[PDB]
Structures are given as C-alpha cells and as structure tokens.
C-alpha cells in the first residue's frame, strides 16, 4: 500500500533515503495487535482513530486527555492519517495529569496494570507498550518496565530530551526494553535527544504532525514523538509474523538503516528504524 504526501516520519521509516513523501506499508497494517499508550490519555472519539481507541484505566478523577501529549503519541501509533499502524487497537492508560506530571508509584502501577490487562484484551498478533515519559534514575521504575517486558509486552520507551547520556534516566536506562532516540528530517540526531549505549534505535522525532485534542492536529517535537513510530512498527512487524515481543527490539535493530544518521556521538548505535517493505 502507498499513502501519498505522508507525514515525513512515516515516509522515512519505509525509505532507504531522506526527503521522500510516500509512506509504504503492507495493508495488514497491524490488524490483530494491541498498543497501550501509557501517557496522559487518548481522546478516543477523535475521528482519526475510527473507533479503534479505548480508554482502559486512569489514576485521576477523569480519564480524558486534558493535555494533548497522549493523543498525539497515540496518533503516530495508529491514527488513520498520522499513524504507523493504521489498524492497531489503541488502549489508553492515564498515568500523567493534565499538566504532564506523574508520581513514580503511579507509573509503576500502570505498567503493572498492562501486564495483567493484556490477558483480558484480544491481541492475538501481539501487545506493545509505548512509554513517552521519563524522569531521574529509579531502580523500581526500571524493574517495573523489565517486569512488563517479561510478561511478553514489547516495551518501547523514550530516551529523554536533555542532550545527555540516557543511563541517568528511567525507565530509558533499563537494558531489557527498547530505548528510542530522535532524529530529524535531514537525518541528524535531534540536538535535544539523549544518547549513549543503552539506546537501541532512533526513529523520526522532530516536527512530527499528529492527532491533538478537540479533533485537532499539530506538530511537536521529542523522543516522546520518536517512541510511537517504533511501537507502531513493532506492532506492524508482529502482525506480518516477522518477530515476537521478546525479540522485536533486536529485530528492529538488525534490519534498521545503518550509518544514515549524523550528529551521533561515539558509543551510540547509528540505526534508524526501517519497516523493510518492498512492494
């Protein structure tokens, strides 16, 4: 399938080169998979989700997304125009308040929830979690993300945005999951993106257009924006049978475009996520 005049990040992750404008992908488009956007929520009524997005859990008086961050991240996963995995089932878990803040306890519980909730949802091709959030180093947050990952949920986390090594951030610094840095439309590392050995992969992160609350769209930048490409790719590749949860970060590493990026400091993988589609 071909979606013309696509958001640059979708076209990039189906391309071997920069500056192209058509997103290429297999029409199965992640059908039968499930992604948990663990974030501020999802405006599940947005026309762009087509009834494929539900709110499953909140730790606040409301489950509505009153900030916008989660709706954007969810759209890159699977909105009809701005998403990588245009047929995936989107489940929202609101752990962050409408100001974008959340206590670590809340964040651990929410990962625990998804570890159990997946056994109540039909996701026969696989389950993916996207964590576009992070804070300072926490062994417990890291342990909680390990525990998800181990419960057979491919877990994709944001590297963070301080332009520093990701070893001093969580859950970014957990070796067992998939830590995602950001790159721009000219194949540079984003200047704000963290870096280091714990990164697994870079996906598109600068000036990312996606769904926003009120049935609106907008562009924003971050690893928080990079992480949803890879989860949706993780969810897309699992539906094609190519890979499992236990192993999708490694598979996405092996088949990623190599050496394309500049602005990468020594000790960090030069690997930009690629979907490997040949029509």
């Amino acid at each position: 399938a071909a979606q013309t005049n696509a958001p640059w990040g979708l076209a990039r992750i189906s391309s071997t080169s920069p500056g192209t404008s058509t997103y290429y992908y297999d029409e199965s488009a992640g059908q039968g998979s499930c992604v948990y956007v663990i974030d501020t929520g999802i405006e599940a009524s947005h026309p762009e989700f087509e009834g494929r997005a539900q709110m499953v859990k909140t730790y606040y008086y409301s489950s509505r997304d009153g900030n916008g961050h989660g709706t954007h991240c969810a759209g890159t996963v699977g909105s009809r125009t701005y998403g990588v995995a245009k047929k995936t089932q989107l489940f929202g878990v609101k752990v962050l308040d409408d100001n974008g803040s959340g206590q670590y306890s809340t964040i651990i519980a929410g990962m625990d929830f998804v570890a159990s909730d997946k056994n109540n949802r039909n996701c026969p091709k696989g389950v993916v979690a996207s964590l576009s959030l992070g804070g300072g180093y926490s062994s417990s947050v890291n342990s909680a993300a390990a525990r998800l990952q181990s419960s057979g949920v491919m877990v994709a986390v944001a590297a963070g945005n301080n332009n520093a090594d990701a070893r001093n951030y969580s859950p970014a610094s957990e070796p067992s999951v998939c830590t995602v840095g950001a790159s721009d439309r000219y194949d540079r590392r984003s200047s704000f993106s963290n870096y280091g050995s714990v990164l697994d992969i870079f996906g598109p992160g600068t000036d990312i257009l996606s769904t926003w609350i009120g049935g609106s769209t907008r562009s924003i930048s971050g690893t928080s924006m990079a992480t949803p490409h890879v989860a949706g790719l993780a969810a897309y590749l699992m539906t094609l049978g190519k890979t499992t949860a236990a192993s999708a970060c490694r598979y996405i590493a092996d088949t990623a475009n190599k050496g394309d990026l500049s602005n990468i400091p020594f000790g960090t993988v030069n690997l930009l996520a690629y979907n490997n589609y040949q029509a």
Binding site: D39, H69, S101, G102, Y104, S132, L133, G135, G160
Partner: peptide, 6 residues
C-alpha cells in the same frame, strides 16, 4: 519522584 512527558 515525579516523571514527566518528554
């Protein structure tokens, strides 16, 4: 501690 949107 408090975590935050990235």
């Amino acid at each position: 501690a408090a975590a935050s949107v990235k």
